[PDB]
Design a protein around this ligand. Structure first.
Ligand SMILES: Nc1ncnc2c1ncn2[C@@H]1O[C@H](COP(=O)(O)OP(=O)(O)OP(=O)(O)O)[C@@H](O)[C@H]1O
Ligand SMILES: Nc1ncnc2c1ncn2[C@@H]1O[C@H](COP(=O)(O)OP(=O)(O)OP(=O)(O)O)[C@@H](O)[C@H]1O
Ligand SMILES: [Mg+2]
Ligand SMILES: [Mg+2]
Lengths: 142, 148, 145, 149
């Protein structure tokens, strides 16, 4: 795994920086023998992941996932995310939308599932699913 | 890899669903308990069954009131168009059906023997189940799993 | 062994009530069983017991809150305190509203409860409201309600 | 148990905060990164420290620019008003404060020996750690943990 994560780091940093309004300038992916360590740069110094708040963690996780899919956009080309907004406050949710129109759109195919209507804005195609009589009903919108 | 169409019958809340996936960001909005993750997990069952995920069981996923669970998946990969079709019969495991085909001309042709073991062996070589669950399909509640 | 059966059984009847309410009766009852120190939970759907995997992600959070409330309600005189950090994740618009309802209906029967959240909507079902912001590298608490 | 006031100094995002909890529902609205969970974990730290939570280590919760961490908790349990004071310092014990007291009139009096050992033992008999953790303080991300077996 060591060699793996030491490739997407720069992209994850980039994304995480815009996700948190520069609050965290960078994401470091170091090696520690049979176990990789991830740190965040706060006020110019590296801090362990425990440093983050819960919502910040979800943001860093989204950043890695997108960075990952991006790095592999050629060989894999697909990312499927199930509910990306839990723990995000109103502001981080609006930032997510920007990160969608900016990075998520760089992936050939993305299937995103969510209860959050707000995400409809940065989607290329929209499908509605609802429960109509004990069974799921699917409606194509965008 | 790119998903094209998924047909799901009698899988959890899905009675008879058909979704067509396109390029770019495909969003599915729904409420709690509407069918979203069920559809996604149906895709996972269609691609890699038998899965050894504790919360997805054959005996449990058959839609209540039904017997026939049917999953048909059409997807592209490196220029080739593939198709996996699976059927589970509640109460009669001898009735399961598993087949994977490729679009040759305009006619689906078996790419391997129609069975779980054969299909699985072919999928693990076309795209390893391991990479699928770690970098492709991030299940609900698993977004920060990569951090650990 | 049987005194825990009595406690659990009681908490389950409490959870069933809150959960039926939380889900508008979609799930009519929560069952709690004990086959040799192994506690299993089931939700009654369309007349029969269903394992917890039957639930959706949002529903599983709603059932979890139902057990936390029920739990605090059953110990309300021995403990009297419940602290919930971010109770809203995975819950859709409707379930979030519904939750508020569950709040000044059950959450008000516990002596003291400390809630923490980023959802300003819970600002209603509260008795005292406190804002916390991060001003210049440090947290600033301002009292409101 | 009922919390009255929490005073924290140099704990994560907290440099100097004072919260007065009341009866009934007490909400604390804040955005991601504001300090919500930080305050709650300090309360946990000041009550049962030393803890057994891998994701909470001393050398990490001391506010960056600071040297000492201060947590003062005043709570009521069965008529008695207690108060626990923890003062963390990365250097000497002389400055370290670990005292749990009982209110007698207008004066606080040692409930026992001022040390992590004695205070731990007394808190464990006043309110067991485990009961606090799966019945009282439900940390972020642990709401449905109670469903797990
Ligand atoms: N075997 C079954 N037969 C019929 N209905 C089922 C079955 N298994 C699950 N369900 C229903 O499917 C719902 C869960 O589906 P799913 O997990 O797809 O929802 P969701 O759209 O992801 O919602 P959330 O926002 O809560 O994640 C539950 O509400 C449940 O009632
Ligand atoms: N040692 C430290 N010194 C200074 N600030 C710190 C320290 N450790 C963490 N922080 C800051 O505290 C914040 C996390 O605090 P906390 O977990 O209390 O937030 P929160 O209000 O719970 O947010 P969320 O909605 O994301 O849960 C981080 O944004 C981080 O920058
Ligand atoms: Mg779901
Ligand atoms: Mg928090």
């Amino acid at each position: 795994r060591e060699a793996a994560l030491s490739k997407i780091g720069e992209l994850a940093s980039e994304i995480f920086a815009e996700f948190t309004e520069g609050k965290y300038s960078e994401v470091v992916v170091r090696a520690e023998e049979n176990k990789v360590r991830l740190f965040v740069v706060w006020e110019g110094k590296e801090r362990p992941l425990t440093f983050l708040s819960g919502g910040e963690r979800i943001a860093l996780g989204l950043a890695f996932r997108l960075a990952m899919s991006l790095y592999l956009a050629g060989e894999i080309s697909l990312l499927i995310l199930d509910e990306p907004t839990p723990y995000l406050d109103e502001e981080r949710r609006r930032k997510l939308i920007t990160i969608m129109e900016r990075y998520l759109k760089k992936i050939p195919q993305v299937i995103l599932v969510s209860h959050d209507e707000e995400l409809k804005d940065a989607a290329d195609h929209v499908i509605r699913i609802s429960l109509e009589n004990g069974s799921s009903k699917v409606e194509v919108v965008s | 890899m790119k998903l094209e169409r998924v047909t799901v019958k009698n899988f959890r809340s899905h009675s008879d669903t058909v979704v067509e996936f396109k390029e770019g960001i495909n969003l599915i909005i729904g409420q709690n308990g509407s069918g979203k993750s069920s559809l996604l997990d149906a895709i996972l069952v269609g691609l890699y069954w038998p899965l050894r995920i504790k919360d997805i069981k054959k005996d449990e996923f058959t839609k209540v009131g039904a017997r026939d669970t049917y999953i048909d998946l059409i997807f592209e990969k490196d220029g080739t168009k593939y198709r996996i079709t699976r059927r589970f019969l509640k109460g009669y495991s001898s009735g399961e059906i598993h087949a994977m085909k490729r679009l040759v001309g305009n006619e689906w042709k078996h790419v391997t023997e129609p069975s779980s073991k054969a299909i699985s062996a072919f999928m693990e070589k076309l795209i390893p189940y391991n990479i699928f669950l770690n970098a492709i399909y991030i299940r609900q509640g698993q977004i920060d799993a990569i951090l650990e």
